């Protein structure tokens with residue numbers, strides 16, 4: 001028994017190990033969202049401002065493609081833990097790779113430093129993200145009802161790190177000390193790794209020390225050749241295009257765009273064509289197709305707050321917060337703190353609205369439709385402000401109001417999708433259903449990598465109105481099938 005080897009109390013009424021992983025996940029998410037908040041400005045700011053001087057659209061595309069690959073890397077990363085290392089080994093290995101990637105950005109390696117950093121953080125996040133979360137659930141016995149509250153505490157560390165790191169790193173953006181700020185994130189991640197190394201054995205015991213489905217001798221040869229050949233094809237294609245001077249980021253963004261649209265098709269088709277899925281379960285998988293489209297439309301607009309809305313605010317607004325006499329300069333990195341702050345303050349509030357309803361509360365489709373409509377309206381709001389003011393500089397309050405309307409939509413959509421990924425999941429395809437709910441974000445980010453290229457031809461203001469309209473009309477179309485989709 002893995003439960004007999006660990007403490008069952010010790011961290012606010014939950015296993016002591018939830019305390020070790022809260023500290024690790026806080027420091028890892030602190031360094032991730034800190035690095036991310038700075039990265040967009042580090043890329044497109046001029047060389048004389050200590051940036052890389054990359055074209056605005058290419059910097060926006062790198063941000064969205066980087067985010068897509070982090071979520072896609074969870075899929076092979078969960079597999080490596082399930083079949084090769086176990087969840088403990090993948091977490092430790094993944095954490096070490098994330099540290100290397102942050103150190104890559106602290107060094108004066110310009111573009112080599114940027115892409116080698118992304119490479120290490122993509123692989124490391126894939127190995128750490130799904131497996132640290134798996135260990136949290138395995139700390140609880142089969143019939144223990146504390147598990148849901150345990151994850152509510154676990155995901156507080158995620159939003160706490162996301163809130164605090166842009167506030168701390170705004171100083172490094174202001175003085176243009178990008179390397180200094182990226183070293184702070186590397187030191188932040190090092191605290192999380194040292195804490196795991198000091199307290200993982202006595203608090204996590206034997207949980208996750210070995211893979212659940214180990215590979216047989218023949219499978220090590222089979223999967224080794226297939227993976228070996230895929231890693232060999234990617235290396236040569238990138239090397240031949242580099243030395244012939246025909247390698248651009250368009251190669252990476254187009255490959256990831258294909259993966260973003262191909263992966264959801266492969267997963268849905270497998271679950272529908274399987275013989276280990278009942279007629280009742282097959283109808284729920286069919287009913288999650290329009291919900292997947294709504295989730296994708298939601299995450300498309302929400303994730304654009306890290307590379308489109310913030311640059312627009314920095315370039316077109318006054319960047320002067322002004323609320324009931326409280327006026328101060330609004331730092332560009334602090335746009336990334338609005339979303340995690342409102343989740344911390346209003347996630348338990350919206351949770352009590354549904355708990356004081358029970359049967360009165362709306363369906364999964366109505367919650368997914370409310371969320372996508374609010375995300376669509378947030379882009380209509382800022383688009384109409386740009387259209388109304390034109391060349392005139394408007395208040396940063398309008399940009400903040402856009403982020404606030406989008407986070408309110410996330411409070412309706414994000415928890416519903418987590419519950420849908422487990423309730424609508426077939427008995428044999430639980431891990432595959434967690435991948436489709438995860439892919440609503442990855443697919444949206446893969447589309448965003450190419451969707452940002454429409455900003456120059458359409459214009460930044462029309463781009464916001466077009467996306468917001470597309471999101472609302474498709475939501476209202478899917479909303480006419482709300483009684484049908486409820487199965």
Ligand SMILES: NCC(=O)CCC(=O)O
Pocket residue numbers: 033158159162305336337339340343
């Ligand atoms: N759970 C993490 C978030 O939702 C925050 C992301 C953001 O800074 O926009």
